[PDB]
Amino acid sequence: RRKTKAERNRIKRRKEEERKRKHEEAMKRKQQQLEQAKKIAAEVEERER
Amino acid sequence: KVTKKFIINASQPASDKIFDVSAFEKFLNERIKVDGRVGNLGDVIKISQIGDGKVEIIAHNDLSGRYLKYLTKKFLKKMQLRDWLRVVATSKGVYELKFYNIVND
Amino acid sequence: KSLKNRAIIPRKAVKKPLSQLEDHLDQLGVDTEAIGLRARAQT
Amino acid sequence: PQEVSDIKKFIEICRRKDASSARIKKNPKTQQIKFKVRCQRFLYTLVLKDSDKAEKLKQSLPPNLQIKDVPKRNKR
Amino acid sequence: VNLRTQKRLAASVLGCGEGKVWLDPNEVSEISNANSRQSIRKLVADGLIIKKPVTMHSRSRARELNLARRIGRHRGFGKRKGTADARMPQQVLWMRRQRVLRRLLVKYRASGKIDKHLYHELYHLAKGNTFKHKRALVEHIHRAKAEKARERQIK
RNA sequence: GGAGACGACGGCGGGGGCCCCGGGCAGAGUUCUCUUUUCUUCUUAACGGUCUAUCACCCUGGAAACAGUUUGUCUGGAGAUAGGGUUUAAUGGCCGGAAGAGCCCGACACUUCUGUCGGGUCCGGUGCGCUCUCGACGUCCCUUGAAAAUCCGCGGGAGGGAAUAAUUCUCACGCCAGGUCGUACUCAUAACCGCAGCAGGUCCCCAAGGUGAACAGCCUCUGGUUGAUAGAACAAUGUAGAUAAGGGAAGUCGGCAAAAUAGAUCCGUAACUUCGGGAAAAGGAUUGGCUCUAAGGGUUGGGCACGUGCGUGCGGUUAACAACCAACUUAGAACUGGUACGGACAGGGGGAAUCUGACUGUCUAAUUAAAACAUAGCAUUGCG
RNA sequence: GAAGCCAGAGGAAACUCUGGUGGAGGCUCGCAGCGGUUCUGACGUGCAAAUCGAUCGUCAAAUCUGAGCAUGGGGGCGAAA
């Protein structure tokens, strides 16, 4: 059936909501990597060796 | 409810007995307008003296320090001190009165 | 005032004479010797 | 200029041979910190929240890489 | 003592016109001793050279006239100088009216107040200049609904 | 095979910049009185990442009770509407660049050398506005509106290719190199030409505010000037600008010149005509200020039963209702000043006819702009 | 305010009328530009070996204009003076 402007606005709002959730989850994984940065440095050292 | 704090420092001209803090308080009480009308202070804006030639303004509305500086300059023009006294923002919400730069001739 | 053709120079950009300041304060009724404007005046 | 979103990739970039220098920029109004490394082609910027672990990332950064803090005024 | 070079240098340093440059008339020799942009900057910092502010061009009367024209003044037959089409185009009025009517018809069809056949008929009536405005279109839609309900009750 | 690579004009939509409106911090001005006032700074490049942007294309499905749809009537069984996607296109949002810059304000230091340290640089709105650019349409042609260098894609399958590992990978990072000139300044009432620092001539961009239909006229902001022999007096005759009682062309070869008309809204408009015009024909009524009224818009938002912020199965078209936001026109009424009301500026005198050339257009630079020339149409001649 | 289009009212239909839409024309008022009609105009050893003022024609095109290039005196070019 042909959709309504309210339904289109709801679809749009879900689109920016999922974009914001992706951005927040990327910030969380960056923070986790910053927390475990020393092990990452050791692994980079091991790979270069 | 938000509360805004404003200091009008006039300690140096008050100690030099050039600026009258009580007269300035009366001028502020008669000229500060709320909702476009003077004499509409009530409990919204309170003007007092905290000593040492300093004026306290407590405002629960969106009163502006720019408006307070405008009224201070109006009072200085009425007292013929506009050409010799300057109102300078020193801190956030604090306006201090001081002399202009003077040369010795 | 000549505001039709040019703007008035700001008061902070012009340094005031001590003699003029003492004369104006004396006319207003302030004892200049009791406050010491000579020390406040620069050179 | 390029922005790095991975701590591992930034560590490898700082261990690249062409990484001549590095600097740390602090933005306290935004409460963020930036690690900028100067390579041959690109300046790589890592953006982090201002935190103690962000400060301790200096220890994981290589020692021979000359790292400096950005002053408040860029004096010519 | 000539100060043309100093005035030009002060204008270039201060980033203004040469008419906005003020040189101190009591420090003419010290200003004339300045031949470099560095010395001009030093004199600007010392205050012997300042940039004069701009000449006043206020907009208060224009804003007052805009308020008066918004509340309805100064639009009489002795104030109009262009033709009616020149002041307000009939083509722009028609475009606005057609866009309002088509937007309302699209909204009604989407919300299900009117069906698709009635939408087509009202679209072609709107193109054929039946309705002066949205209110007239709404009354026509209400009358059509009332006639349809009366026909359904009769049948 | 594509790109390079292409006309003119018309309206419509998107984006940047400019203009305009409101709030805030800081500074400046005004202040007899009024003005929470007026003005000023409040900015973000190339180059990249990422998320999106009309056309178009694809999948499902099969439409008359025809439907979708633009300001503009085009599209559809050669597959529309609807639903879901894919992509050309950024001068759009955010991020890196990049605040460390630029800008504004303040406080110290300062023979100079020289500066030093703080606080900010924020949030919105509007549009028949101006300018540039992009996109989709449309109109016109007996007019159909460059070429090449250069770059890319495809068809084809020659060669070259691996487990001693190979790689002839348009991916990422890294290494090296980039020669010659020209670059000042003017571009014009003084830098060019006219014998000259000559009121002449000489090709382009960028283009603020008010009035107003308007890059009309007039005033103003930025930026520029204040440069063109001076001083005194106010005779005749001049050049330029004006007014004049009464009469109103009696003037003069001749209404030459001047005056009168003029914008906008409404009423109304003849003969003739190639039916397109004439026509703004003619002739009339009105226009200031103030206080109101009315009309013309945009955005968002519907109840159950389950699974669990979405998926179905239903149920209803009084949302014909609420909340928020918004700008310019049009019409009507009262009151009020008047010698004036398009109060300056700006801006058709009109009509009855005759001759004449069809019209638009062109020429005698430096005495003639026209019934001259050209033009479309028509007619004739020559050529296979 | 030309084709084209929409709606309403008639007509058996072709068409007729009414109200809109649309934006055509070597159309029209008019700014700049281009040109050069008139004035007992200014100027007349001039600002000028053709200039100045007002007024005027034209203003979406047979419009205006730069650079490069071509045509050279028994010639060229010429909407023909």
UniProtKB/Swiss-Prot annotation, chain C:
It is found in: Nucleus, Nucleolus. Transmembrane segments: none annotated. Signal peptide: none annotated. It comes from the Eukaryota. Belongs to the TRAFAC class OBG-HflX-like GTPase superfamily. OBG GTPase family. NOG subfamily. Involved in the biogenesis of the 60S ribosomal subunit. This is Nucleolar GTP-binding protein 1. It comes from Chaetomium thermophilum (strain DSM 1495 / CBS 144.50 / IMI 039719) (Thermochaetoides thermophila). The lineage of its organism: Eukaryota, Fungi, Dikarya, Ascomycota, Pezizomycotina. The chain holds residues 510 to 552 of 661 of the full protein.
